[PDB]
Amino acid sequence: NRPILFDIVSRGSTADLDGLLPFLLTHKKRLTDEEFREPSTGKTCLPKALLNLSNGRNDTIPVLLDIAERTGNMREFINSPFRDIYYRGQTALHIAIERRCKHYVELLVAQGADVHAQARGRFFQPKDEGGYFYFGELPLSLAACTNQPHIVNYLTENPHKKADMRRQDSRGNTVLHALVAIADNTRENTKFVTKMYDLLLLKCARLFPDSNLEAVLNNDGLSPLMMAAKTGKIGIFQHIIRREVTDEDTRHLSRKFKDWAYGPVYSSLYDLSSLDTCGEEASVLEILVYNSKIENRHEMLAVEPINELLRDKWRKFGAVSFYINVVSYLCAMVIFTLTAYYQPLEGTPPYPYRTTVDYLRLAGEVITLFTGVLFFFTNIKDLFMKKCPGVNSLFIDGSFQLLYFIYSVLVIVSAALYLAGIEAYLAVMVFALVLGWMNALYFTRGLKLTGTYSIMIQKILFKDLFRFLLVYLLFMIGYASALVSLLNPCDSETFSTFLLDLFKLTIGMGDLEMLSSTKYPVVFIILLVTYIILTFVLLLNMLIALMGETVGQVSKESKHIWKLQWATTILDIERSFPVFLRKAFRSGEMVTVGKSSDGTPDRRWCFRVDEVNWSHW
Amino acid sequence: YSIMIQKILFKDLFRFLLVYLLFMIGYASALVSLLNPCDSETFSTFLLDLFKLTIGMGDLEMLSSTKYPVVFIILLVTYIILTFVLLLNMLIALMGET
Amino acid sequence: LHIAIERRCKHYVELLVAQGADVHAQARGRFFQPKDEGGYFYFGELPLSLAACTNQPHIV
Ligand SMILES: CC(C)C[C@H](NC(=O)c1cc2ccccc2s1)C(=O)N1CCN(C(=O)[C@H](CO)NS(=O)(=O)c2ccc(Cl)cc2Cl)CC1
Ligand SMILES: CC(C)CCC[C@@H](C)[C@H]1CC[C@H]2[C@@H]3CC=C4C[C@@H](OC(=O)CCC(=O)O)CC[C@]4(C)[C@H]3CC[C@]12C
Ligand SMILES: CC(C)CCC[C@@H](C)[C@H]1CC[C@H]2[C@@H]3CC=C4C[C@@H](OC(=O)CCC(=O)O)CC[C@]4(C)[C@H]3CC[C@]12C
């Protein structure tokens, strides 16, 4: 009777249901029998009834519920989960909440519907994973994400059952996590997201004063603030940063306080308990800066407390140590260069050290080798410090983090050769020296006047020049192969010499003498002319077009990128300090702005700023 | 013209010349160290030859005496590529923006 | 007097002036110094100047 019952329930007719209870009683057939359930997805009568209905009044639900009650299988029937993959775990309560009908939600909850059921189907998974909609996999979270304040209010406080707001799904995300996940930067979405977030946080704090909801962390270890920062959702992030609660009862959980006003000047005291961490836990600032592929990183960096904190941190110790860094590195490079120049070609390495100059010469090599080893150790410590960032962190951006690794290798590699491979240690030592000299732009990144230059040269080099060089290499290969084939000698050495001559020509110097020996000289000259014309005239200076366009983008965003680079370098410098010293350099005050519910002082670290307003009269 | 040449000269050209001098120092020191004569006068003569090359004239004859000529040519090619191709006319980008 | 003027209350200003409050007293604290020097607000270091800079025509 599955098809007939499905048709009856879909049509919404109530008279047809008459006589079903006697049939079930006589045949002792439960409403959850496999035959009744749809084989495709284990769907039952109730979800079909709730899916299709007229103005939210299908009118068949109470009769079916009474029938199930008479059969004595109400608990199993109401909360029967869907099987299969796409809609696994879905229940009747989720559907009732989705269709925005309060009456059916009340009915299901009163009759005993489970309120903690989790929907884990692939359709409910995040967008990037394959599911078109994600809401935290909970009824209350689903209601909150769909902008239904009345449903959330009723479900939180019900005489039958209550859905605790501090409940985590399989992913670990709680209601706030899901609300942030679906948050969008659109004008309309942000307003309701913030309103629901504030309402839910206030309710949770009111009901449970001891525990703060935002404290809970997901499996990834992030909090709603940290997750919003990582996902690039500025709309909720900025609101969370400057959250202020006027209510006296629950004003403790506020993040922005008022210090004092003198005339147009207003000084306010922000809180940064978790915004800045001295290695104790992950900080919003590090996640915002180091992480890649963030939609609105530049905008999120330009917030009231972030800029002031960066400025104060830079003034306190950043400038003092940055110049020390530059001086030490330049001195080491000068020592390395002097060691490289005064290298005795005569004799088999290693050499005996007996003379006065040996005292000075050996020290340079020892210092350079120890510096390379120190660089390698620093670069492995840093890699493990950031929890082993993947390829995207190293290769695509922060190229200097990789280059010093290469410099770390060669410098020590040569040493091995210097002990056994005496003959050819110079070949790689000189290349290491060149790379070390060339990779000093990391220290120039910080300077405001020349901060952009290094970033934009690194950007253009790998992206524009290589893309152009693909086509240039196509041309080079074709023309060089053609010219090599054409010439008549009357072979590897001849080909190499011809390639050398052609490269010398390509620079713009040399002489055109090859045509004399070859046959068909006229076509040879025609081909050379086409080569020169195409490459030099068009490509050589048409690359400059998009190169200048790239520099134009960098010029348009020069101020924004410099701020990012300066923040990166100062944070970099900070992170290498020991934990105890970092704690000794803590920034902010210990103002006891307010007392807890029991009266104990909060005594939380904060940071005060000030601004000027003239319209506040 | 006068105001903008005075402005660009001290601000753009010097900022670019810092990086250019880093490259120059590194490459020149490397090449001087690499060559085997068998010293101040030799270094000065090599620097003169390398500058004459940097302009775009002169001849590449130094490789004959030195050992490991292939790496020497590779390094010279990297020098020429980087400086001339990228920097020499990428300075022009921000110069034109100024 | 400076505080009374700042809080925009005319009554207390009248009371202090009538009772004999000094009207030429100068405030020279670092907080009152110019912005670039270290003081967040500068108004000439006088009561009348403070009232004028705060847009209080009646007090002036
Ligand atoms: C000691 C503190 C007061 C400051 C600290 N400087 C140093 O420890 C040393 C400098 C020098 C100079 C000559 C010889 C020996 C040393 S030891 C400092 O401020 N930093 C080092 C850690 N940093 C890094 O490791 C970046 C970011 O992770 N990676 S890197 O590109 O590979 C790099 C950059 C510069 C230096 Cl140099 C070493 C490295 Cl692997 C950042 C910046
Ligand atoms: C335009 C650019 C970006 C692409 C070309 C890459 C260069 C690095 C190539 C172009 C021509 C090449 C040269 C062509 C011929 C030779 C000679 C070869 O050794 C010889 O002198 C041959 C004599 C012999 O072996 O008997 C060593 C490499 C070198 C300099 C090659 C090294 C690499 C060069 C400079
Ligand atoms: C790219 C630019 C902006 C930076 C380089 C600065 C130039 C002014 C340097 C580059 C090479 C230098 C030259 C390298 C070698 C010499 C030879 C030296 O005297 C000699 O002829 C050496 C012979 C001897 O003393 O026995 C006088 C300076 C000169 C021309 C140097 C003078 C200054 C030069 C041209």
Author numbering:
A (entry chain A): 150 to 639, 662 to 788
B (entry chain D): 602 to 639, 662 to 721
C (entry chain D): 242 to 301
Share the article's original sentences.
Particle subtraction followed by focused 3D classification of the transmembrane region and RhoA-bound cytoplasmic domain were performed, resulting in improved map qualities for these regions for model building. In our ligand-bound 3D cryo-EM reconstructions, we identified strong and unambiguous EM densities corresponding to GSK279 (antagonist), GSK101 (agonist), and 4α-PDD (agonist) located at a shared site within the cavity between the VSLD and the TRP domain (termed here the VSLD cavity). Mutations Y553A, N474A, and F524A significantly increased EC50 values of GSK101 for TRPV4, consistent with observations from the structural analysis. The GSK101 binding pose remained stable during the simulations, supporting its accuracy. However, in the GSK101-bound open state, the SF and the PHs move closer to enable cation coordination (the diagonal distance of G679 backbone carbonyl is 7.0 Å), which is consistent with previous mutagenesis studies. To validate the S6 gate position observed in the open-state structure, we performed Cd2+-dependent blocking of TRPV4. Among cysteine mutants near the S6 gate (I715C, A716C, L717C, and M718C), only I715C showed substantial inhibition of GSK101-elicited current by extracellular Cd2+, supporting the observation that I715 faces the ion permeation pathway in the TRPV4 open state.
TRPV4 is a polymodal, calcium-permeable cation channel that has emerged as a potential therapeutic target in multiple conditions. Human TRPV4 adopts a two-layered homotetrameric architecture where RhoA attaches to the bottom layer. RhoA appears to act as an auxiliary subunit, interacting with the ARD through three loops connecting AR2-AR3, AR3-AR4, AR4-AR5, and with the membrane bilayer through the prenylated C-terminal tail.
